Amino acid sequence: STECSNLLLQYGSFCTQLKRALTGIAVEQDKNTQEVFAQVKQIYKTPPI
Amino acid sequence: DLICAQKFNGLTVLPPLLTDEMIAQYTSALLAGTITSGWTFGAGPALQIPFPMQMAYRFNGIGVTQNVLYENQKLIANQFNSAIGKIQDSLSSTPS
Amino acid sequence: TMSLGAENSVAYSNNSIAIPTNFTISVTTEILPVSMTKTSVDCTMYICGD
Amino acid sequence: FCGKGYHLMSFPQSAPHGVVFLHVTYVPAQEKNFTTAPAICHDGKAHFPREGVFVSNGTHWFVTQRNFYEPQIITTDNTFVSGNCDVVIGIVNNTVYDPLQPELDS
Numbered sequence: 001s002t003e004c005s006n007l008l009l010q011y012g013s014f015c016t017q018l019k020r021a022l023t024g025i026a027v028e029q030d031k032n033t034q035e036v037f038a039q040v041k042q043i044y045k046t047p048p049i
Numbered sequence: 050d051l052i053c054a055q056k057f058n059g060l061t062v063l064p065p066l067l068t069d070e071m072i073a074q075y076t077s078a079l080l081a082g083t084i085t086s087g088w089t090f091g092a093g094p095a096l097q098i099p100f101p102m103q104m105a106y107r108f109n110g111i112g113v114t115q116n117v118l119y120e121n122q123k124l125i126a127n128q129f130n131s132a133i134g135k136i137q138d139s140l141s142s143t144p145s
Numbered sequence: 146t147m148s149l150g151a152e153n154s155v156a157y158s159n160n161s162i163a164i165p166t167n168f169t170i171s172v173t174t175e176i177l178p179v180s181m182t183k184t185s186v187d188c189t190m191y192i193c194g195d
Numbered sequence: 196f197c198g199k200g201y202h203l204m205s206f207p208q209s210a211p212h213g214v215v216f217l218h219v220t221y222v223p224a225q226e227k228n229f230t231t232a233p234a235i236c237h238d239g240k241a242h243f244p245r246e247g248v249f250v251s252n253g254t255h256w257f258v259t260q261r262n263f264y265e266p267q268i269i270t271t272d273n274t275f276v277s278g279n280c281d282v283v284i285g286i287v288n289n290t291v292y293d294p295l296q297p298e299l300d301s
């Protein structure tokens with residue numbers, strides 16, 4: 001609905017705030033995974049025996 | 050059709066940057082470092098050490114002499130293998 | 146596809162050890178936030194002005 | 196926790212809304228391969244390092260500290276005896292010097 005979006009524009013930057021917060025959470029999760037698992041810069045391998 | 054409806058309502062799930070296989074690869078690298086090099090790889094270059102000598106170093110860390118580990122090496126290895134098997138059985142047999 | 150890191154096969158054997166013969170004194174930086182900007186809002190003046 | 200490497204000390208620095216820690220750490224470098232053994236068999240007794248590790252450069256056996264290469268002669272002062280040579284897996288035969296031996300010999 002275009003008319004709904006036009007009425008939604010009167011409320012300001014609520015949509016931008018919600019998108020920014022979700023984007024921050026989304027990058028935060030990847031940062032969490034990097035912090036926990038990507039703690040070595042060398043990929044070590046076990047000997048064949 | 051829960052996922053389809055959630056997608057269709059303007060909510061989109063974004064894939065993790067690290068895929069499960071790469072996270073598994075990172076865990077494999079950490080396991081290879083801690084097994085072949087002990088704690089050396091975490092503090093600098095990976096220095097190879099035999100695993101019984103590494104376990105003896107860890108025994109010294111908790112205040113037990115090296116001889117206790119070396120004399121009872123087969124018993125300690127059997128206990129560790131049994132414990133790992135018990136861990137796999139416990140995870141497979143418990144829903145919670 | 147992103148590279149996790151450089152492959153480094155450690156030469157593990159049952160009777161060989163690697164001993165450091167030298168050292169590097171490395172200084173590294175760690176930045177930690179401690180405080181934020183302290184904000185006070187006059188609720189009546191913000192919502193209603195005068 | 197306090198930098199990459201074995202932590203030696205840290206220095207605090209003020210920053211706008213924050214702190215910067217300069218972590219001074221010890222990083223091992225220029226590592227060298229050595230042949231290692233868990234214990235030394237001498238006179239039917241097993242000798243274990245008191246604080247170090249047994250290393251071999253190819254022909255001779257020494258005891259050195261784990262985090263830096265400083266080879267020293269294997270004596271009764273830096274090793275301790277626990278048991279015979281029949282139990283430890285990978286024990287090698289080498290002599291263990293006695294400081295008291297030249298003293299009572301002369």
Ligand SMILES: *[C@@H]1O[C@H](CO)[C@@H](O[C@@H]2O[C@H](CO)[C@@H](O)[C@H](O)[C@H]2NC(C)=O)[C@H](O)[C@H]1NC(C)=O
Pocket residue numbers: 154155156157163226227228
């Ligand atoms: C210790 O010796 C091992 C092998 O005896 C060395 O490992 C080799 O390193 C070269 C160059 O890095 C590789 O091309 C070989 O494939 C490695 N061999 C194995 C079996 O991994 C190791 O580099 C030596 N350590 C030092 C510090 O020189």
Ligand SMILES: *[C@@H]1O[C@H](CO)[C@@H](O[C@@H]2O[C@H](CO)[C@@H](O)[C@H](O)[C@H]2NC(C)=O)[C@H](O)[C@H]1NC(C)=O
Pocket residue numbers: 166167168169225
């Ligand atoms: C240990 O490494 C240091 C450097 O980390 C070496 O010092 C260097 O020695 C060469 C020749 O003696 C000089 O040209 C360099 O300027 C020195 N560097 C520094 C930072 O002082 C030292 O020689 C190494 N020691 C051993 C036994 O390998």
Ligand SMILES: *[C@@H]1O[C@H](CO)[C@@H](O[C@@H]2O[C@H](CO)[C@@H](O)[C@H](O)[C@H]2NC(C)=O)[C@H](O)[C@H]1NC(C)=O
Pocket residue numbers: 252253254255
């Ligand atoms: C391992 O180190 C020892 C001691 O540093 C070496 O023994 C000496 O070797 C030099 C030259 O080869 C001789 O002049 C000395 O007489 C030796 N000392 C003793 C007490 O015998 C030994 O050669 C080194 N091994 C290798 C393979 O380099």
Ligand SMILES: *[C@@H]1O[C@H](CO)[C@@H](O[C@@H]2O[C@H](CO)[C@@H](O)[C@H](O)[C@H]2NC(C)=O)[C@H](O)[C@H]1NC(C)=O
Pocket residue numbers: 236287288
């Ligand atoms: C280390 O020394 C011991 C004792 O000198 C050696 O054990 C002897 O081995 C010979 C040959 O195999 C046998 O005939 C003797 O009966 C053994 N004696 C004892 C008390 O066990 C042992 O072989 C040596 N090990 C190495 C690797 O040289």
Ligand SMILES: *[C@@H]1O[C@H](CO)[C@@H](O)[C@H](O)[C@H]1NC(C)=O
Pocket residue numbers: 159160284285
């Ligand atoms: C080390 O392994 C090699 C071959 O893998 C074998 O010949 C040797 O007996 C082993 N030594 C010890 C102390 O286990």
